[PDB]
Amino acid sequence: GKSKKWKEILKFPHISQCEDLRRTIDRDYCSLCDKQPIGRLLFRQFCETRPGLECYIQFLDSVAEYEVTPDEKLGEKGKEIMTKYLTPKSPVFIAQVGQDLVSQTEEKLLQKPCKELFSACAQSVHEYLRGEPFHEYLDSMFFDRFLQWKWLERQPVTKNTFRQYRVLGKGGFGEVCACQVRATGKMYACKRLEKKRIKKRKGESMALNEKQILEKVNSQFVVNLAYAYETKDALCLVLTIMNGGDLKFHIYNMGNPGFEEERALFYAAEILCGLEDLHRENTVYRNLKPENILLDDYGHIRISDLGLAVKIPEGDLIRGRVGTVGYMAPEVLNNQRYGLSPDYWGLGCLIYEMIEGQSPFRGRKEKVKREEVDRRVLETEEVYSHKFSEEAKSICKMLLTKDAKQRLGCQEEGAAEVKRHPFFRNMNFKRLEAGMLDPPFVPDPRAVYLDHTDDDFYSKFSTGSVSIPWQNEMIETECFKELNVFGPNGTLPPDLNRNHP
Ligand SMILES: Nc1ncnc2c1ncn2[C@@H]1O[C@H](COP(=O)(O)OP(=O)(O)OP(=O)(O)O)[C@@H](O)[C@H]1O
Ligand SMILES: [Mg+2]
């Protein structure tokens, strides 16, 4: 439900207003033609204009198809790409790949198909497009149009930018509205943080830390920040909305308690991919527990509640002793200096609890004081049942290795070590990362499953819209599709023409 007036509020500014942006935007190929959703479409749209560029995009498109293709049909899709782009006769023959590079891929398929067959040629294409095609696209009307989208992105976010609907919960610092953008109609979830609740607690530092972690992560498996605006009586964090309920609910109230191993595997796989993205920024999450893994409407999961997460300077350790009783890694309970390893401890606790329907150190039916829980965590070896394949016992007791020095993924290799583990022997992370795999359970839609130091913090926190999620909102809500229109027969529309404003 877009507002009746949306075409105006999202009206492109005239190109003449974007001059500041033009000189300040850093002209990085990978950012402007790929990381930024709308710049990606604008560049691809620029390549369709000239013919002989268009085959390079058609190629990269099919490589992406081939990299997820079911392993049974991998080489079958390879042959098709070979007879379309890697053969001199074909009309969409890509020449900047070189007759060398293709002759090598020709025997790569004769030497059995792997997902990285065409990865060679693809880089050859990206190395070319970064060159001449990019700098034409910059001095073209499609980057002028990209600047207009950026102009709208940087526009100021206020309470009137949204519609705050039913409240889905209550939080430590405030309630969690279910807000909608007026112009686009996209649904999000507000995290309302009452003012004085921060002021009395001196929680500014941990509030700003959360906002900053949230906006620096672009992951499918971690809640994303789309907006950070301040109001007269709160500070809002607009995030990904997740209505599928949380994992705790599905482990216990929907479960046996517990999942089939194959069901738990899917969840683990995504949680693992989620942790990998946090760990690219060398950020540690530390709050892994079932009730913090949320499900969306399609049935996929994301990691929620990052208020306990901190960036770690590369090659430096942190100290904490924070978390939840029974989901705290040994090194945390001992208040030792640690790195990212607590998060693989948490993976072990999440895979165990999903298969067995209870914590690896606390019976679902057990009364135990906090002390004995921790004692077990540090001293007792957990037990497994016939609910666990050999493969699943293995991964868990490796992730639940007391000594974080011999714990999975805690070596230089990292999460790559964990994906290889035989528990994911049947999991295809490329297709998972691509959404090709169907979640095991799909949730039914209609279900319930006062000074200047503050003025400083306020403005540091209230930075506005986040770039990547805001451009995705435009595309998703077909606001890009409708508004991104040019002139009849490839001519300058009036908003991109300097001759008449
Ligand atoms: N991404 C989201 N989408 C929809 N609702 C969400 C989302 N994230 C959190 N919530 C809701 O927020 C409510 C709980 O609030 P919140 O997590 O902020 O603090 P809490 O419940 O007091 O405990 P804690 O923060 O320590 O986990 C729940 O009702 C949950 O459904
Ligand atoms: Mg919270």
From Swiss-Prot:
Cite the record's tissue specificity text.
Highest levels in heart, placenta, lung > skeletal muscle > brain, liver, pancreas > kidney.
Q: Which cysteines are joined by disulfide bonds?
A: none
* Activity regulation (record text): Inhibited by calmodulin with an IC(50) of 50 nM. Calmodulin inhibits GRK5 association with receptor and phospholipid.
GO biological process terms, semicolon-separated: adenylate cyclase-modulating G protein-coupled receptor signaling pathway; apoptotic process; fat cell differentiation; G protein-coupled receptor signaling pathway; negative regulation of apoptotic process; positive regulation of cell population proliferation; protein autophosphorylation; regulation of cell cycle
At the top level of its lineage, which domain of life is listed? Answer: Eukaryota
Which residues constitute the catalytic centre?
N287 (proton acceptor)
**Keyword Kinase (UniProt):** yes
Which positions fall inside the AGC-kinase C-terminal domain?
425-473
Residues bound to ATP are L168, G169, K170, G171, G172, F173, G174, E175, V176, K191
Q: Which residues form the RGS domain?
A: 29-147
Q: In its keyword annotation, does this UniProt entry include Signal?
A: no
What does the record say about induction?
Overexpressed during heart failure.
Entry similarity comment: Belongs to the protein kinase superfamily. AGC Ser/Thr protein kinase family. GPRK subfamily.
What job does this protein perform?
A: Serine/threonine kinase that phosphorylates preferentially the activated forms of a variety of G-protein-coupled receptors (GPCRs). Such receptor phosphorylation initiates beta-arrestin-mediated receptor desensitization, internalization, and signaling events leading to their down-regulation. Phosphorylates a variety of GPCRs, including adrenergic receptors, muscarinic acetylcholine receptors (more specifically Gi-coupled M2/M4 subtypes), dopamine receptors and opioid receptors.
| Name of the protein in its database record | G protein-coupled receptor kinase 5
The gene it comes from is: GRK5
